[PDB]
Amino acid sequence: MASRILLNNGAKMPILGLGTWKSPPGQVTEAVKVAIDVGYRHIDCAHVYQNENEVGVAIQEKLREQVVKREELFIVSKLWCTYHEKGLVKGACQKTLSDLKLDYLDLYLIHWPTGFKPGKEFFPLDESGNVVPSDTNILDTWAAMEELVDEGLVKAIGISNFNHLQVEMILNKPGLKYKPAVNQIECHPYLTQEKLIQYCQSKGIVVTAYSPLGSPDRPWAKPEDPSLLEDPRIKAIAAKHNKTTAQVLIRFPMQRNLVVIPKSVTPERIAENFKVFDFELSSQDMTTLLSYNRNWRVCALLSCTSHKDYPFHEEF
């Protein structure tokens, strides 16, 4: 297991990154500091997580301390839905850069295919509670993302939560200048994404697996949802390998040639989650873990099911 995967922009991406959604602003600076100390070289961020300033404090301290060089870090952020207008994309990117206190991003993603009315609210609502869409389509947002590359603000651009027909729309875009480098999508043994992953990989798009542990801290969790970390069948595979269940859940996407971004603010778990370069799941183990799919989603963006570009009506 090589630690980096080559992207279609010619850059190499660390296959293990630290996630930061739900990382409290008072804890994420230490979490990122610890992660860099123990080997992480990829951080997944987003403006909508509201903690990029604090992530950036950690990155800047470790660069100043010469723990790491900027070229060795792979920092990812995402354009929120209320900034899909061509006129707003550069400013959104520059706010993220200023907060992370970076002069470029390694990868900038369209966070969802759905554009929303611009304004202060991240989910603008009409008086009946529906998200108010914007009329800007993904192809024009993609052209705006391409401009960021040509201005030196980002080294790579990509997409997130795009279904196969939306990926296809970008790939067939008239005048397409840069293909997406990455599609970041939810992926774990209960949502194995075999069709979308094969589609993307056949097109040279690298897939990043989010919520690889099933996001036990998601705010809408219910007692009765399936729990990957407690699943006896996955615990048994971990036991056989003398690893934790989380380590198996992280190694699993790695062996599918995916990038994976487990979140933790717990220093011991940050370190444990990185220790996944000392063991191999068998092909039998991989097939068995794939057999647990149930099309169960952590992130279904339920407030936006009537948006024209809602991604999860389509089978994949």
Ligand X SMILES: NC(=O)c1ccc[n+]([C@@H]2O[C@H](COP(=O)([O-])OP(=O)(O)OC[C@H]3O[C@@H](n4cnc5c(N)ncnc54)[C@H](OP(=O)(O)O)[C@@H]3O)[C@@H](O)[C@H]2O)c1
Ligand Y SMILES: NC(=O)[C@@H]1C[C@@]2(NC(=O)NC2=O)c2cc(F)ccc2O1
**Site for ligand Y, rule CB under 6 A:** 22, 219
Q: How far is the CB of 312 from ligand Y (least distance, A)?
A: 16
Size of the site for ligand X (CB under 6 A): 31
Question: Which CB, 186 or 284, lies closer to ligand X?
Answer: 186
Q: Cβ distance 266 to 273 under 8 Å? A: no
Beta bridge partners of 108: 77, 157
CB of 1 to ligand Y, least distance (A): 32
Residue nearest to ligand Y (CB): 219
| Residue 269 sits in the site that holds ligand X (CB under 6 A) | yes
Which is catalytic among the residues 40, 49, 108, 199?
49
Minimum distance from CB of 64 to ligand Y (Å)?
28
Output 80 or 142, the one with its CB closest to ligand Y: 80
- Phi first, then psi: give them for residue 209, nearest 5 degrees: -90, 115
Catalytic residue status for 178: no
Looking at 141-149, 170-178, 256-264, 278-286, which segment touches ligand X (CB under 6 A)? 256-264
Q: Which is nearer to ligand X, 87 or 303 (CB)?
A: 303
**Which of ligand X, ligand Y, none binds 44 (CB below 5-8 Å, type-dependent)?**
ligand X
The letter for the amino acid at 109 is L
At residue 34, the 3 state secondary structure works out as helix
Q: Is 266 in the site for ligand X (CB under 6 A)?
A: yes
The answer to whether 73 is a known ligand-binding residue is no
AA identity, residue 291: S
Q: Minimum distance from CB of 237 to ligand Y (Å)?
A: 29
The phi and psi torsions of 21 (rounded to 5 degrees) equal -65, 130
Q: Do the beta carbons of residue 33 and residue 20 sit within 8 Å?
A: no
CA dihedral 276, 52, 189, 255 (to 10 degrees): -40
Q: How far apart are CA 38 and CA 58, in angstroms?
A: 14
CB 292 within 8 A of CB 191: no
Nearer residue to ligand Y within complex by CB, 55 or 258 = 55
Instruction: Select from ligand X, ligand Y, none the partner in contact with residue 273, using the beta carbon and a kind-dependent cut-off of 5 to 8 Å.
Output: ligand X
> What b/e readout covers 132-169, taking b as 16+ CB neighbours within 10 angstroms?
ebbebebebbbebbbbbbeeebbbbbbbbbbbbebbeb
154 and 160 Cβ atoms separated by less than 8 Å: no
Please, which of residues 1-40 interact with ligand X by CB under 6 A? 19-22
The entry of ligand X, ligand Y, none near residue 219 (CB within 5 to 8 angstroms by kind) is ligand Y
Half-sphere exposure of 53 (CA within 13 A, CB side): 3
Question: Is 1 annotated as a binding-site member?
Answer: no
DSSP class of residue 229 equals G
286 near ligand X (CB under 6 A)? no
Considering the rule CB under 6 A, would residue 241 count as an interface residue with ligand X?
A: no
Q: Which residues pair with 32 in a beta bridge?
A: none
Binding residues for substrate, as ranges, are 111
Residues in the annotated binding site: 10-19, 111, 211-273
List residues with catalytic annotation: 49
Contact residues: ligand X, CB under 6 A: 19-22, 44, 111, 160-161, 184, 210-217, 229, 244, 246, 261-266, 269, 272-273, 298-299
